[PDB]
Structure formats: structure tokens, C-alpha cells
């Protein structure tokens, strides 16, 4: 019992962080194969970030422009490449820490695990969602770019984030490793503002889930509901709509704990509507929203 | 900017993690140098837990019965020798992973992050404390004992718990890796109940001092405290009393925000007296007590 906000263990992914620097920028690389990746904005200067040319800003860069450090080793580029807005340097040797791997590009709602990097190294790994407007709220700083986002299934590392940039709020937005920005962000120094942030109703199901399992069933009320008359109280508090593919991917869950899904929304319902009440929940005073239904079975089960 | 739960790279402690058995008990040890260190528990049986006599059981265990297995590798026992509650099996092959290390014993309100495994095999990884009743509230399931508590300072990893006990309420209880217990509990299925739960003090105001750093500063007010008015209230909210100790730790979070420690001390007992008001802090309806001074200096700064 006990329910924590988990991360995947690092490990797998600290052997493949690298020091990427050109010119006077360093920041994060990842390692795979014999190519590392890290954000194109690694070739600009604070001035270019205004408005930056990419293609033009990469003419004057060469393969030995791009210093890649693993360790206290240097790695030699032999070619470099830009996909989107990630460059790929192709070194001489490959990461004999490579693990077996895929990359990803994950829906909103969807977790993954952060190992946030500095020069290279890392400092720490915390638990994130991609939010429905497509931010992340992380925990960066100068120097972070570079550092990514994970899930892993066994012995396979499914990349699904790379960090990018800080937007004036002080949210995070960041690319697949195809280099294709989550949401609309554009790697340039302009103000970009995000959408609502709305919660992710079926992560809220999921978590109060996890909380019957774990012995908090004091918000359980004797109701139940539809699909439509729980949508029609979500879209009031900024939840995300239901679906039948939710109520689906909520079965194992319910199955376990015997409440029916439309049950537990009857009971969702109620929490938005009166409040916790100075009450909390898994040590919460809010519906946490980021774990997946997923999660909530690894972490009920034992899945390692 | 963001504030996270953050947990250390787990990177060294997976390679340290092994699986160790006796009998029909599985559980999780921990490899360093020539050394498998394990709750001294694996050697019972559901029978045995309810009054064990450890060293009568202990006399009928060889060598032999423990199973030490790493990966998918073997490891010859040749010694083996209980120290307090944890059972140090002596290996013929010393760890080839043996990151540095320290074995420490932690103060109640210091944190740590739990590598959780099972089988030898890490799942997850999460950020703890050490409660002010000597309990963590963890996420352990059965098969997760001898899973570790661990802090890095660069390179060198300081173990302060190994995962012993679930106790009737579902908290937990372990010691640290000279196999003393943390608190008054037992390995024994007996009926141990812990103490009041209280708030560590010190740690709400260095996450007020994160969260001001970040931006959220509606809570600060127009006022300011002494030590003994705010632990009269403190003492009313079961939150531990703030010595001057505290307040020097707190020193560097003073500096750089420029809040006189007293002056956040005002704010924390009005959000006590007014609580939140359907408001948030760093994401949470609730004030945080699982940053020490020292993680919230060392997520700020960037420390790797
Ligand atoms: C200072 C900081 C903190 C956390 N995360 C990231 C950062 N850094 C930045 O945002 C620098 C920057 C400026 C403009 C565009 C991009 C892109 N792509 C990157
Ligand atoms: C089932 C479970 C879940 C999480 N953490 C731990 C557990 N397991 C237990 O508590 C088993 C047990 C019984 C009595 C005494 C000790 C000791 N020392 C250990």
C-alpha cells in the first residue's frame, strides 16, 4: 500500500546523457547509436534567438563546431544533420550504453519521466504529464534544454520528450525526438502563450482508483451517472471530456475495486461540486491528474 | 523555474540491486563491494513472523540456502553473519558496479529517494521522508523489502534505509543499513501502531521559499513573528517546533529572496489560521513538507 508520484528508474537513460556545446551554448545531447541529439537552438547565440534562421544560422557551423563530451571523453563528430528542430550528430563510436529503444510521440494526458540534465549530467528525475495544451510542468533551469522524457516497458526505453524551452510563465514545451514540437511552440524568443490548461479526467479516475485501493473511500457516495450528465459538470470545471475509450481503459481498475466507472464519476462529480471540505485524498488536497490508468496498474501490481 | 518532487538519478543503486532468497521468502538485497546486505526477515516463514526468535532460526540457514541471484547470474554465498535487523551475506565477487559509498542514519524530517524493486529488479523511484514518528509514507507492495533509501552528494551514494515493514495503517517502517530501526517498531507481525504524524516545520518554509522564488507569493503578508509566537502556534497545527537551527538553515532561501526567516514564519501561521482559501501553492492545496532547506537550494541551483 501507500501511493507515490513515480518515476521510472534513470539509469538506463543517465548512460546515454552527453555535454553538447557550440560556440559559447552548452546544453544536453542524448546518446543512442552512434548519433546524438539535442535542440537546434544549441547553434544560436542569445541575439539569434530573436529571430532565428536556423537553415542560415547552421551554414557556418561544420562537424567540429560541435563539441560532444560523455563523460570526461570527447566524442568526434563525423556528421550532423538537422530533423526539425533537433540536430543529430553522428559521432565515430557508438554508445556502449545504448538500451534497446523507440521513439515516441505521446498524446496529452499521456506520463512519462523527466531526467533533468545539466552539462551533460544528471541532477534529478521527477514524474510529468504532457498537458492538454501541450506544456509540461516540469522543474528546469538555464542549461536543461537537451534533457528528456521517458517511459520504459521491461528493458525498452521509449523516448518521448526532449526538452526546449521555458515559456513566460514558467511552463515548459518541448519536442518528440523526431524534433516536432508538442503544441503549437515555435524554438524562437517571442512570447508564446499556452491554451487552458484543463485536467485530465481519466487520470483523476485512475488516481481515485488508486485511492479505494489504498484504503481512502470516504468520497464514495451512494450516486452514479451518464457519460453526457458527467460531461456536462466537467466542461463546467475545465475537465476534459469522457469518452467510451476512457470508460474502456478504466475496466482493469474497476474490475479490481468492483466500482463501476459511471460510479466513480457520480463520485468525481460530487468532489467538483462540494469540494474536499478541508479532506484529502492518497495525502492530497487536490484530484491529482497525473497518473494514467496505466500507472495506477504498474504501481498496484508490481511491475518492474 | 517549476518545482518538483524530485528524486536522484537511480543509476547506481539499480546496479547494486539483487535478489535475494531463503526458502520460499524473496526479497531484495543490496550488493556493495563483496557484501549482499537484506532484512534479516527473509529468513522466516508467515509462521515465524508472528513471535521469531532470529538467532534460533538463523542456527538451521547455511551458506547455501541463501540464493543470491544478480541479472541472471549466480552469486556464490560464502559467508554470512546478522547485524541488528539486516543479514550481510558475504559474496565471492565483489560488485563490479560498486558505486562510492556511505552508510548513514538519518534525523526524522530529512528526506531520501526509494529505488522500489522486486525480484531484484527496480520498478520505480520516488522521493520520501523520514516522518517526525520515524515511519515513510512509501509505495510498497509485498516482494518489496530490502528495497533502499539513498541521498547522492556528486558521486558518492549515502544509504540511510532499507524497506522492512508495512505496518496495520499501511505506513511504513525500516532501518537504516547497520540494520537498526528507524523508531520503536520491530520485524515482527505484531500489532505496532506509530506516532502522531506531525508537520516538519522547516521543510514547509523552504517549499514557501521555493514557491517564492517560482512566482507564487500571494501568501505573503504584511506581517512578522517571533520563535516562540509562531510555535505556539505551530504546536496547535501538530507542526514541529522551529529552533534556531532551522532558521539558520534556512539562511540561504533568506538571501535570496530577500524574506527575513521570521517574516515567512508570519505568512505560514496565517495560512494555518486562514487556510488556503480554495487556493495553491506550487500546484498544491496543501503546504509541503517533504523539501528539506538543502533540496530546495539544490533544485534552484542546479546541482548535479
Ligand atoms: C532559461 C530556461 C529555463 C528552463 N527551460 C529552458 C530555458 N531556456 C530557454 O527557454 C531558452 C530558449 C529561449 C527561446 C527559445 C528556446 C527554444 N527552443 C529556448
Ligand atoms: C506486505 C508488505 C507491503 C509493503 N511493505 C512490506 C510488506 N511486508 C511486510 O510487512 C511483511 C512483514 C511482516 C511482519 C514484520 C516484517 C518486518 N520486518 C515484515
Given at each position: 500500500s501507500g501511493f507515490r508520484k513515480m518515476a521510472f528508474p534513470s539509469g538506463k537513460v543517465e548512460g546515454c546523457m552527453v555535454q553538447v556545446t557550440c560556440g559559447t551554448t552548452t546544453l544536453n545531447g542524448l546518446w543512442l547509436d552512434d548519433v546524438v541529439y539535442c535542440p537546434?537552438?544549441?547553434?544560436?547565440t542569445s541575439e539569434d534567438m530573436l529571430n532565428p534562421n536556423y537553415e542560415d544560422l547552421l551554414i557556418?557551423?561544420?562537424?567540429?563546431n560541435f563539441l560532444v563530451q560523455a563523460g570526461n571523453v570527447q566524442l568526434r563528430v563525423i556528421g550532423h544533420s538537422m530533423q526539425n528542430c533537433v540536430l543529430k550528430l553522428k559521432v565515430d563510436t557508438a554508445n556502449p550504453k545504448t538500451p534497446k529503444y523507440k521513439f515516441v510521440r505521446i498524446q496529452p494526458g499521456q506520463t512519462f519521466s523527466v531526467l533533468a540534465c545539466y552539462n551533460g549530467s544528471p541532477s534529478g528525475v521527477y514524474q510529468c504529464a504532457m498537458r492538454p495544451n501541450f506544456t509540461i510542468k516540469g522543474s528546469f533551469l538555464n542549461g536543461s534544454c537537451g534533457s528528456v522524457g521517458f517511459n520504459i516497458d521491461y528493458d525498452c526505453v521509449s523516448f518521448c520528450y526532449m526538452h526546449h524551452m521555458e515559456l513566460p510563465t514558467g511552463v515548459h514545451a518541448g519536442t518528440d525526438l523526431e524534433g516536432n514540437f508538442y503544441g503549437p511552440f515555435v524554438d524562437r524568443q517571442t512570447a508564446q502563450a499556452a491554451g487552458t490548461d484543463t485536467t485530465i479526467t481519466v487520470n483523476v479516475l485512475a488516481w481515485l482508483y488508486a485511492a479505494v485501493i489504498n484504503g481512502?473511500?470516504?468520497?464514495?457516495?451512494?450516486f452514479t451517472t451518464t457519460l453526457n450528465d458527467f460531461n456536462l459538470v466537467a466542461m463546467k470545471y475545465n475537465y476534459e471530456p469522457l469518452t467510451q475509450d476512457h470508460v474502456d481503459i478504466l475496466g482493469p481498475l474497476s474490475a479490481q475495486t468492483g466500482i463501476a466507472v459511471l460510479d466513480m464519476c457520480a463520485s468525481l462529480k460530487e468532489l467538483l461540486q462540494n469540494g474536499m471540505n478541508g479532506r484529502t485524498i492518497l495525502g492530497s488536497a487536490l484530484l491529482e491528474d497525473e497518473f494514467t490508468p496505466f500507472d495506477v496498474v504498474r504501481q498496484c501490481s508490481g511491475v518492474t
Open positions: 537546434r537552438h544549441v547553434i544560436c557556418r557551423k561544420s562537424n567540429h481512502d473511500r470516504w468520497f464514495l457516495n451512494r
